[PDB]
Symmetry: C3
Subunit: 149 residues, 3 copies
């Protein structure tokens, strides 16, 4: 209902923010706690993770290849399938300060997510990053946003 | 009432996000569907649109002059006139990757909007962009924010 | 309760946005009206303000040292202590266009705040800025975010 939808929108947004916080803090175990076992992550047509352990592996090196990151998540649009499943579209600005000497790398992106509520906690079941564009960035492959020509 | 205000704040924000999404996707018809016929848009003291058809014309070339854009909308403040009319103030970060060879153009702005609810959908009745500042941008004229000196 | 929490989350966010607006507008008296007398502000281990008058002093020169600023506040996480006291964590992107000839200065930060509700208005009781990183910026000292190594 209305009440349920409003409260859960807040909870979903909070989880997404906790995710970005723990990412900028280099807390990979906290990050993995926000994904179900049977998850999928897609960062490019030939790059992602199937299942939580594979996802954990994608987190390796956050602490070593970057001196810092800053994630700014906005434009969050939530459509409930049910009270324990929602589809989310959002915008991300992610700045990366590398450990190697090179300009900061900027990702302008969209996330297409499905989140599920389990034992009182929202978690990611699927995340699909679509890359709007990048600057001085370290990843070449990407899922396009599908901009009309 | 309280309940009404909360639900409609979510709906207004969703519409604003759908707008920015369809803009970054180069979907001008979806954009125009989010404006009433009797709308006004102001981007500079001598630049805007009176009525929806004129607004549609301002969308020409999105696909040709830019390879991509990314809009990040935040700091959304909503004051209800009534349950079907609200005044909104918000902040925008808009990055533009040009089709011509030149640095990305950055707009730091404020939107002063009036939105109205018609047949279940929020739409823009007025948008006024105030330009806080810009970098490497393609538009010179602007409405100032009115910063105190 | 639920209803209270939702309404007050909106009010707290609104206050935070009003703060950033008045800051970008160079309105120091409006800013100071959003702090209690017995406040604390921490921007670095050896830099801040104890009490509202000291805070007011930190606002001196906004109009003179910058031609403009733009603050984008996102990722707002609110934990209520009570219905009139909350702890907030948020992300900030703050761009500064200097009056002196130098590149824009960018702050990527986190705010750790305690807000209190007094006579119907949320106000800051404590703000602690943690600096994720900066670019071409004018402040060297900072409170670290505490990123895991
Ligand atoms: Mg295991
Ligand atoms: Mg017609
Ligand atoms: Mg006094």
């Amino acid at each position: 209902m209305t009440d349920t939808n409003l409260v859960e929108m807040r909870a979903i947004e909070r989880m997404m923010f906790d995710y970005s916080y723990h990412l900028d803090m280099n807390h990979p175990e906290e990050l993995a706690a926000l994904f179900v076992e049977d998850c999928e992550v897609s960062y490019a047509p030939n790059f992602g993770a199937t299942g939580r352990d594979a996802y954990k592996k994608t987190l390796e090196g956050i602490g070593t290849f970057f001196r810092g990151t800053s994630h700014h998540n906005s434009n969050i649009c939530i459509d409930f399938v049910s009270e324990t499943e929602a589809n989310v579209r959002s915008v991300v600005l992610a700045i990366h300060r590398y450990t190697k000497e090179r300009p900061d790398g900027i990702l302008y992106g969209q996330y297409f997510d499905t989140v599920v509520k389990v034992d009182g906690q929202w978690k990611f079941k699927r995340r699909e990053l679509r890359t709007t564009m990048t600057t001085d960035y370290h990843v070449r492959a990407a899922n396009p946003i599908g901009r009309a020509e």
